[PDB]
Nucleic acid binder design. Structure first.
Length: 370
RNA sequence: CGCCACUUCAUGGAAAUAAAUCACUCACGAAU
């Protein structure tokens, strides 16, 4: 039937998950490139597809080449005809091969024990404060670009009011304790180094395009690994290997573990995130892509949200795999993890319906909440 | 007037003292 795996990635060296105004972008190519802390789920999909072809010896080698029909059909049945695409955001099927669903990438801490792994999540933006939202006729009201919404009274749940100077919840990641949420600073998880690189020969070149590039390489602290859950169609197999995930040939180690069958991985991820639940808000655990933010703000009053940029590399089975890849023509803005959507009385169901209507994005571990 | 010699052969003090003990300039430049 279907087969469920847990896939742990261990950084062998300093990795580089980059992208936005990255190098070789032109328009002041901006040699200084900073690494994103996580890869896009598209990178996860592509890595899975690349390794699936590696196991079956179906990769493209040598300069521009061709394909015979039967290997084309086996690539169809294994990986799919087309990469992760934003245009298929409302397709009810993943449009790929044996891959059905992947959980959002999760940060996992591996203590030196048989003891289980602690799952670390970004700290909710509302953690530490209470939002009361007093609404009995006009007593206070705010317009967000021309929409009526209640007033967000925010107090430190410890009265005073929200001092943005004290606000440091965006710098923390959380995990479950006995009954205390364990807060970890982002620096205690990711260490960064700036690298200076040049081309030695020196030929005719112009700045941002000849030499002298600086890249941010991230290292993940000792006992921390990246993980996700995958469902495969059952006629394939995933083998432990050494992978390339990210930019500048960032090399990782796959440990593929088979979890017991009949296990919906979405329920597993939500069980992991259960300790952050609050009855009055929806916690965004992974980037979300509501097609109308004004529509969402209609039913949510205070959206304690941030934004991340998403851009995808678009390739098919027959594409120049050695060349400037085709990037997604549109830049897609996603809701940062840890974002808080505060809804009206009731009305939770149709905002959840708006969030889950992107079933293709739900399957690629994006619009996940708790 | 005649005759005639012996003795002694460096001790004490001063044995280095003071002034200068590194100074100025350059402390990275150009292309990338």
């Amino acid at each position: 039937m279907n087969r469920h795996y847990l896939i742990t990635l261990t950084p062998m060296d300093w990795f580089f998950f980059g992208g936005e105004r990255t190098l070789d972008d032109g328009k002041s190519a901006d040699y200084i490139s900073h690494s994103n802390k996580f890869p896009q789920q598209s990178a996860l999909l592509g890595m899975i597809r690349y390794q699936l072809l590696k196991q079956h010896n179906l990769l493209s080698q040598f300069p521009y080449t061709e394909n015979k029909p039967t290997e084309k059909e086996i690539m169809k049945t294994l990986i799919g005809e087309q990469s992760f695409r934003m245009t298929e955001r409302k397709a009810k099927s993943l449009g790929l091969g044996v891959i059905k669903q992947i959980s959002p990438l999760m940060l996992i801490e591996c203590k030196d024990d048989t003891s289980s792994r602690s799952i670390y999540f970004p700290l909710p933006l509302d953690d530490g404060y209470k939002v009361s939202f007093n609404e009995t006729s006009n007593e206070d009201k705010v317009f967000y670009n021309g929409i009526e919404c209640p007033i967000p009274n925010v107090y430190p749940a410890s009265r005073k009011f929200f001092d943005h100077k004290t606000y440091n919840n965006y710098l923390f990641w959380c995990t479950q304790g006995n009954n205390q949420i364990k807060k970890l600073l982002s620096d205690e998880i990711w260490i960064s180094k700036m690298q200076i690189g040049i081309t030695k020969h020196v030929e005719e070149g112009e700045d941002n395009d000849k030499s002298f590039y600086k890249q941010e390489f991230l290292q993940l602290k000792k006992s921390f690994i990246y993980a996700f859950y995958i469902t495969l169609s059952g006629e394939s197999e995933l083998s432990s290997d050494i992978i390339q995930l990210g930019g500048q040939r960032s090399v990782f180690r796959m440990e593929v573990e088979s979890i017991e069958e009949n296990s919906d991985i979405q329920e597993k991820y939500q069980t992991a995130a259960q300790f952050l639940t609050q009855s009055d808000r929806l916690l965004i655990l992974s980037p979300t892509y509501v097609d109308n933010l004004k529509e969402l703000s209609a039913l949510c009053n205070f959206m304690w949200s941030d934004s991340i940029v998403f851009r995808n590399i678009q390739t098919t089975n027959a594409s120049n795999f050695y060349g400037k890849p085709i990037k997604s023509s549109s830049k897609y803005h996603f809701l940062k993890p840890g974002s808080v959507l505060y809804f009206k009385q009731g009305k939770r169901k149709e905002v959840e319906k708006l969030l889950m209507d992107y079933t293709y994005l739900r399957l690629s571990g994006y619009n996940i909440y708790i």
